[PDB]
Design a protein around this ligand. Structure first.
Ligand SMILES: [Mg+2]
Length: 56
């Protein structure tokens, strides 16, 4: 299953918070920015997180 490995707190409007154990789903893979767009179904939010912090 998809995983949050490392916690990240939102820092700009396009980002979202993730914490280990949250249920996530992919929106769009990183194209070279270092960020992946996801949904966090635990929190209900959608946006960018650092790619290395998750496994999708
Ligand atoms: Mg912005």
């Amino acid at each position: 299953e998809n995983k949050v490995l490392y916690a990240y707190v939102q820092k700009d409007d396009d980002e979202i918070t993730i914490t280990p154990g949250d249920k996530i789903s992919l929106v769009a893979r990183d194209t070279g920015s270092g960020w992946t767009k996801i949904n966090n179904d635990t929190t209900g939010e959608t946006g960018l997180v650092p790619t290395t912090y998750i496994r999708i």
